[PDB]
Amino acid sequence: GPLGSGGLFFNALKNCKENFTVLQTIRQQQSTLNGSWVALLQTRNTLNRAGIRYMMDQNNIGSGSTVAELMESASISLKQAEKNWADYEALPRDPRQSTAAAAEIKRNYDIYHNALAELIQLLGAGKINEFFDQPTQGYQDGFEKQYVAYMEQNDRLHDIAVSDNNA
């Protein structure tokens, strides 16, 4: 078109720099959310290991890490979840991301995160029965559903940026 090389270059550089900023935004949200999700799963598994060790200790068998060591490890991983979740929330968002879906991920994150913190409290208090009975699976499932939707949203944004860069 009746547009010069200088112009074509400026426009290409403008778009590239915009596209890059989108990928950066998305990559960071992805790594922080992922780090929070993994640390919650770790916490959950560690608490289950603690329950097993407890039930093993009843019949004076049971080895490996102690209930106390496992509880402390779960606390450390829950702190890792929280750290990653704070980083996630503070990141600048892309204007096109749904604020409604962001609110849902957060709602489910708090339910699941709080359930694990509660398990840690129940355990350290001796409320073993309460501990074994929490419907944790449902809480986790609710966060995961949102996590998937969020990633699907971000993959789309990713693709828009890629398509543009290719053209």
Residues in contact with its own copies by CB under 8 A are 9, 12-13, 16-17, 19-20, 23-24, 26-27, 30-31, 34, 37-38, 41-42, 44-45, 48-49, 51-52, 55-56, 63-65, 132-133, 135, 137, 151, 155, 158, 161-162, 165
- Nearer Cβ to its own copies, position 56 or 91? 56
- Shortest Cβ distance from residue 121 to its own copies (Å)? 19
SS3 47: helix
- Shortest Cβ distance from residue 99 to its own copies (Å)? 22
- Nearer Cβ to its own copies, position 49 or 106? 49
CA distance 54 to 78: 20
CA distance 144 to 135: 15
CA distance 136 to 138: 5
How far is the CA of 11 from the CAs of 24, 103, 142, 161, in angstroms?
A: 20, 36, 43, 15
- Nearer Cβ to its own copies, position 91 or 151? 151
Helix, strand and coil percent figures for the chain, each rounded to 5 = 85, 0, 15
CA distance 128 to 47: 12
- Shortest Cβ distance from residue 103 to its own copies (Å)? 22
- Nearer Cβ to its own copies, position 110 or 133? 133
- Shortest Cβ distance from residue 83 to its own copies (Å)? 14
